[PDB]
Amino acid sequence: MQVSVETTQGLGRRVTITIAADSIETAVKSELVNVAKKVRIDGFRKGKVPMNIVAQRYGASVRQDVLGDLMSRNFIDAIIKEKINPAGAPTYVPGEYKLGEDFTYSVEFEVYPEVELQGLEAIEVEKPIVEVTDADVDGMLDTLRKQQATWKEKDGAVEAEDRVTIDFTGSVDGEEFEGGKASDFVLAMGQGRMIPGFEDGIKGHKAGEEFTIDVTFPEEYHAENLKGKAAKFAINLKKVEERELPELTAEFIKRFGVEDGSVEGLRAEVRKNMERELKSAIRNRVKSQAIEGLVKANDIDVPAALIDSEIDVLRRQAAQRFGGNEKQALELPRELFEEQAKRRVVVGLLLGEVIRTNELKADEERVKGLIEEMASAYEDPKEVIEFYSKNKELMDNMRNVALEEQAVEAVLAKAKVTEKETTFNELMNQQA
Amino acid sequence: MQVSVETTQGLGRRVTITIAADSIETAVKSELVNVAKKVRIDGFRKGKVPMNIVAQRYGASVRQDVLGDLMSRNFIDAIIKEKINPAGAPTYVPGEYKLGEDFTYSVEFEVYPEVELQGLEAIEVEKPIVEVTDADVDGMLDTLRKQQATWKEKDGAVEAEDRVTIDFTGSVDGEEFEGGKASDFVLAMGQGRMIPGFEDGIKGHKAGEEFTIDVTFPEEYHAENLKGKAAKFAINLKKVEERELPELTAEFIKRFGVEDGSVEGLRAEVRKNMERELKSAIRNRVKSQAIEGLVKANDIDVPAALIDSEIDVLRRQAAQRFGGNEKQALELPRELFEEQAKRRVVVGLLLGEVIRTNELKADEERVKGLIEEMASAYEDPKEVIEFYSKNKELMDNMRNVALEEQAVEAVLAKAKVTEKETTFNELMNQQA
């Protein structure tokens, strides 16, 4: 058999294969019965009319539709072998059909490039060795202690950790923005829930005076309408409640996911949480050094399509952390996310090539171990472990996490990693 | 942890679970980071703002969106364990949201019932034993011989197997219908491509005379607009070619998927095709006896939804064999397909319950054997076999074919099957 596929323009495709009647006769019989089996209609055939006879009767009428069916089957077959997973449903975009002339349709799909690994040996990574002191523990403990407190109504002055009701309106330089609209909003002070200085500036004000305070948001603020802006908050005030020491009688203080009062338990829980992120933090710097070393020294021309797709994901996610508005995130500025999107694609391409070139395997043992530690954080690890193994997406999505660890270890094994003993204060010097 | 899900009306569901702040505090942290991992944004977290703090800030704004996300994740999890495969994309149908009040959405999904197997031992099946004679072979051979012939232009009388060009219009009783429209249509006579009598009635007419002949379509004709109708065909005529004996020199006669001229090969190919469908024919009667015995004796109440879905599939398929028109098949009459759809659902339920109750396994050996014989009908069975094993849907879809065979054997093993030697003529008596 002979196969021919043409291209009209860009992503446009054309099928229409011209062959001898004998070949057509044979192919149509086989294909039509195969389609009939899919929907189970062949079993309803008593065989009074041969399939070929009806094929050369109604085949002309469904001739256009057959091309569409072929399009449907060929597309799915092709994406399976090229391993492309479309989001929802693909778009084929059919045009006007002329009888006796050509036909144009454009199937939208993305493509992938290839990369070469160079300068791997030239990667020098410094591993700063630091430890967590008991003083660090004290700071964390104190923060946790100030988080909880029992509310008590009073009238007079305002503390730094009181509970207040603030009706405020967000005005930038002289105009209200989309957010910053409050009504009987209750805010817990002393928890660092607002901008540093915001809950400080309102301290000492009576629950009935309008002051208007200048608050400046950092240039690197996630909200574009607030980043690098110095807004003024009127702050009306009306209700203030004192937060007194929480009842250590397990009455009110039982609002924790950890056991109450247990001094050893509290320190133990802090210790495990601190070291867990310490492990992650050191690896993040190691990972960052490796990533920057590759990107800065070796860049590659990346297709715009892949970057464009990354932007949408970023926009949807950004809107969520700005407030939450599905689909409206589409309206968010492209330039803000396009920069970071480029990095995501480059890193992915770099990792993907390492995996392919070194033919890395998805290690089940590695995945299982990670799951067990993570699942151990819950009361019943048994259902949690099974839950992850229950859903295929979770299994595969989590693989990329474990696989990434393998990729890092592979590079580090051949890279120059030097361990240097440093004081905690020394690593704290991150001024630029 | 406590879970809750309420129902508004019908398929309408309500989430909104009210729990203590401590539980919320813990649950939100775990869930949000899990979502962030899915899109790979957690690796961008340097940890300046605790997740809980932002959660009790923007959580209110995205509160509605969270419910939608929960809806999305819960639905997919639920269908996995209940094993329901949605066609494309599900519909959740959201309504108006009132702040401070309730919310209504309705998720459209189908359900399945269960059946009891009774009266299986009461099924008596007669197996008529017949054979194919050489006379049957001769008839088939002659039919095949008349199919092919070489066209030769002439002027005069018309044979029974000539090649003609007929411009006609389809008028029922006094109105043209949707089809029956021809222009320069070339029809090959003697191949039984038209209604018995249609190509017989035009025999003897000159290539330039309008006669108008009454043609009656059978009551059980697939085309509703023609079934039980006696239409009149004008028949204009203009071009007639004689079909002379095909060149047995392998020139013209090479338009077959079988070797040319080979007498033994021709008979061998006929023999294999005839017995293959003979096997199917006897089993179909056996299957029909068992199916009718169950349906006629034991009826079950079937939900309208399942039947409704079956109707659409039938409509789409019916339109294809009537001509071909995707989506327009929706406009086809329901009653025509609803009757047969009921049978499909009942048979499926009966088979499904047999499979579940008798805990039947999908036998790979059975599947492999069927594939090998089927693939043996192609030049290279190797790629064909791998192709079936390549696509999961083909593998699964084909399993049902093999599994049905197993189900039939299981029933027959305990049913009263009697073999009776019969003459071919005897079985031919199917006059009602």
Short mmCIF file of N, CA and C in Angstrom, two decimals, chain A residues 126-131 278 281-282 285 422-431:
data_model
loop_
_atom_site.label_atom_id
_atom_site.label_comp_id
_atom_site.label_asym_id
_atom_site.label_seq_id
_atom_site.Cartn_x
_atom_site.Cartn_y
_atom_site.Cartn_z
N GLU A 126 29.56 25.13 45.29
CA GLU A 126 29.99 25.29 46.66
C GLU A 126 28.86 24.89 47.59
N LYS A 127 29.17 24.01 48.52
CA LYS A 127 28.20 23.56 49.48
C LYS A 127 28.53 24.12 50.86
N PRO A 128 27.82 25.18 51.28
CA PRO A 128 28.03 25.78 52.58
C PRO A 128 27.45 24.93 53.68
N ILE A 129 28.26 24.59 54.65
CA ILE A 129 27.81 23.77 55.74
C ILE A 129 27.45 24.64 56.92
N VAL A 130 26.18 24.63 57.28
CA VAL A 130 25.68 25.40 58.40
C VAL A 130 24.80 24.52 59.28
N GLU A 131 24.56 24.96 60.49
CA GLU A 131 23.75 24.22 61.42
C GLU A 131 22.69 25.12 62.03
N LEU A 278 15.75 22.70 55.77
CA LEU A 278 17.18 22.93 55.69
C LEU A 278 17.78 22.07 54.58
N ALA A 281 16.68 23.57 51.36
CA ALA A 281 17.34 24.86 51.13
C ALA A 281 18.75 24.70 50.57
N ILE A 282 19.53 23.80 51.16
CA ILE A 282 20.89 23.59 50.69
C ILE A 282 20.90 23.02 49.27
N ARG A 285 20.15 25.72 46.60
CA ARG A 285 21.33 26.49 46.20
C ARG A 285 22.21 25.67 45.26
N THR A 422 30.88 26.66 57.44
CA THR A 422 30.56 28.06 57.59
C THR A 422 29.67 28.30 58.80
N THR A 423 29.76 29.49 59.36
CA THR A 423 28.90 29.86 60.45
C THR A 423 27.54 30.27 59.89
N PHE A 424 26.48 30.12 60.67
CA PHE A 424 25.14 30.47 60.20
C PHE A 424 25.08 31.94 59.79
N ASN A 425 25.70 32.78 60.60
CA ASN A 425 25.76 34.22 60.34
C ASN A 425 26.44 34.52 59.00
N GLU A 426 27.43 33.71 58.65
CA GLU A 426 28.18 33.90 57.41
C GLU A 426 27.27 33.74 56.19
N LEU A 427 26.42 32.72 56.22
CA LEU A 427 25.50 32.44 55.12
C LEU A 427 24.34 33.44 55.12
N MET A 428 24.13 34.09 56.25
CA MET A 428 23.07 35.08 56.39
C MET A 428 23.38 36.34 55.58
N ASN A 429 24.65 36.51 55.24
CA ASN A 429 25.10 37.66 54.46
C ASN A 429 24.71 37.50 52.99
N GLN A 430 23.45 37.79 52.70
CA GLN A 430 22.94 37.69 51.34
C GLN A 430 22.51 39.05 50.82
N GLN A 431 23.19 40.09 51.26
CA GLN A 431 22.91 41.44 50.78
C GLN A 431 23.37 41.55 49.33
#
